[PDB]
């Protein structure tokens, strides 16, 4: 499946790509404000996450930081990024279709649609000032909106026990996003998409 990676962003973002175990595709470019880079990534994927990091900086060998989504230092991310992180998230090739969604449960960076370029489905966005908005005790010094999780760490928030609800906090990326994830539990926002469709994700599509 191809997946166009557009930053429409004014800045510079560092985008990634990995199941968790391993990267999709490179697992990581630079794109400047207009760039596009176009991934494969492999049939069948399960739990892929796409994601911009800021403020990066890297060594002719790849290794560095990156002050929002790092994943381990990585410009080829062969893992998941440090929150705050807006996800596009996705499974491909699920007994015959695709499942994708926006997720906040990671905190907020910078703003995202994820939309099919294929036929048969919606895109979802998540494009509020989140960061802008972020409550105080959820601003990361470091850049972005912090879920709770990451904040305080607590079962209620980190939905330990697969029970929790929603939270003042939760109820903040909702209002601001009600087509992303808020929290673990929240009601879905999946998107169900026809098996091998593609797609693209756009970084401050607004």
């Not at 399960?46 to 911009?52: E, L, Q, V």
């Not at 015959?96 to 906040?104: A, L, P, V």
């Not at 105080?136 to 760490?153: E, I, R, S, W, Y």
């Amino acid at each position: 499946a191809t997946f166009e990676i557009v930053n429409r962003c004014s800045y510079t973002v560092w985008a990634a790509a990995s199941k968790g175990d391993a990267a999709l595709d490179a697992g990581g470019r630079q794109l400047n404000s207009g760039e596009s880079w176009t991934i494969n990534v492999e049939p069948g994927t399960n739990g892929g996450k796409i994601w911009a990091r800021t403020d990066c900086y890297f060594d002719d060998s790849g290794s560095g930081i990156c002050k929002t989504g790092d994943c381990g230092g990585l410009l080829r991310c062969k893992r998941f990024g440090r929150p705050p992180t807006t996800l596009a998230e996705f499974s491909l090739n699920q007994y015959g279709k695709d499942y994708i969604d926006i997720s906040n449960i990671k905190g907020f960076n910078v703003p995202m649609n994820f939309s099919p370029t294929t036929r048969g489905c919606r895109g979802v966005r998540c494009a509020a000032d989140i960061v802008g908005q972020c409550p105080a005790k959820l601003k990361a010094p470091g850049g972005g909106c912090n879920d709770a999780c990451t904040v305080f760490q607590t079962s209620e928030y980190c939905c330990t026990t697969g029970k929790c609800g929603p939270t003042e906090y939760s109820r903040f990326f909702k209002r601001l996003c009600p087509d992303a994830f808020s929290y673990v539990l929240d009601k879905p926002t999946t998107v169900t998409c026809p098996g091998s469709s593609n797609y693209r994700v756009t970084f401050c599509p607004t």
